[PDB]
Amino acid sequence: ADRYQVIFNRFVSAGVQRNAVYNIPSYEKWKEDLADAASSDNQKNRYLFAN
């Protein structure tokens, strides 16, 4: 599967319930992005985490 998505309801307050999304890329695409965040300046915030 290219991705697994979860579509749920976020309870902001007693009267506010929005719709929220968790997209989870499968291993192959995730490790490829994790490899680019490590080597490249792109995705700075993820550079340390990826390495």
Binding site: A38, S39, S40, D41, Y47, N51
Partner: protein, 59 residues
Amino acid sequence: IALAGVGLGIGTIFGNLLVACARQPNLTKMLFNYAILGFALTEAIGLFALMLAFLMLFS
């Protein structure tokens, strides 16, 4: 024979340099400068041994 411990020492520096550049790709500039610094310091010892060899070879 002193150069054996010099050339090997240089290889040790560069061997670690590659690993450091792999696990910190966005810090390659500082590591390279330090690697050169270590090479020059070891080369100083190599020249000291070389000078002794020349003194005992040409005199």
